[PDB]
């Protein structure tokens, strides 16, 4: 996260770290959506242009974390993966369309002060909140700058941007399964997700029921925090039918 700040303790208890077993290192962010399901970006697991194709046994999920590098004894919990599900129409070839994946844990994780699931949006909450200018929140342990790394989880609040402005900021073909967020050059404030924040959640707090909803997944961006560029996020609601199908079938 660029131009963010340290998270408060327990501020994002659905935040998950995807951790490579060997070498031991951060792979991506992710989010907890139930006691046995974790949501992330497909490109965290599968990206052939960079020779990336992780299998279940390659990875661990670390839940309840705050420090990036420390083993947070008595606080974090580490889970193994039973199965990875990548969206069948994830477009790694062109534009990261449908950049979404689910991971089923081998065993349910125990909830605690530090570990708790985020909600997924219904159609109405999505329609109400996914509006230009409305702010969401992104969290992660990724780079502090485009080209270093944080001691603890970082957080930044960013406004959703009008679709034509998103489109006009890039040569990539944008789809309805994406949205973009960030400040404009003339707005003064700044901030963005970055490398390593991949797969983490873009959340909004509903003013109707005071619950946090995951509206997006950190997907892509041209560098980080560049003037005139925006961060792109997988549109979770648009892909929720797939999420539900997977959980209903394999849950």
């Amino acid at each position: 996260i660029v131009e963010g700040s340290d998270a408060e303790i327990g501020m994002s208890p659905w935040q998950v770290m995807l951790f490579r077993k060997s070498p031991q290192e951060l792979l991506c962010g992710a989010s907890l959506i139930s006691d046995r399901w974790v949501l992330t970006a497909a490109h965290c697991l599968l990206y052939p242009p960079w020779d990336k194709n992780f299998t279940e046994n390659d990875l661990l999920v670390r839940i309840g974390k705050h420090s990036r590098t420390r083993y947070e004894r008595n606080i974090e919990k580490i889970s193994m993966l039973e199965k990875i599900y990548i969206h069948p129409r994830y477009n790694w070839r062109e534009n990261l369309d449908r950049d979404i994946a689910l991971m089923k844990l081998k065993k349910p994780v125990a909830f605690s002060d530090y570990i708790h699931p985020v909600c997924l949006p219904d159609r109405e909450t999505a329609a109400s909140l996914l509006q230009a200018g409305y702010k969401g929140r992104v969290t992660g342990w990724g780079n502090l700058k485009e080209t270093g790394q944080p001691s603890v989880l970082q957080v930044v609040n960013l406004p959703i941007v009008e679709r034509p402005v998103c489109k006009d900021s890039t040569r990539i073909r944008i789809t309805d399964n994406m949205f973009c967020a960030g400040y404009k050059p003339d707005e003064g404030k700044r901030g963005d997700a970055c490398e390593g924040d991949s797969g983490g959640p873009f959340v909004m707090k509903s003013p109707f029921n005071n619950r946090w909803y995951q509206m997006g997944i950190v997907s892509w961006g041209e560098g980080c925090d560049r003037d005139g560029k925006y961060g792109f996020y997988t549109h979770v609601f648009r892909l929720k039918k797939w999420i539900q199908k997977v959980i209903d079938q394999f849950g």
Binding site: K21, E25, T69, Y71, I78
Partner: peptide, 11 residues
């Protein structure tokens, strides 16, 4: 740069 995690999770 990461602290080693308990071996039980790597088995």
């Amino acid at each position: 740069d990461f602290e080693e995690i308990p071996e039980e999770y790597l088995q």
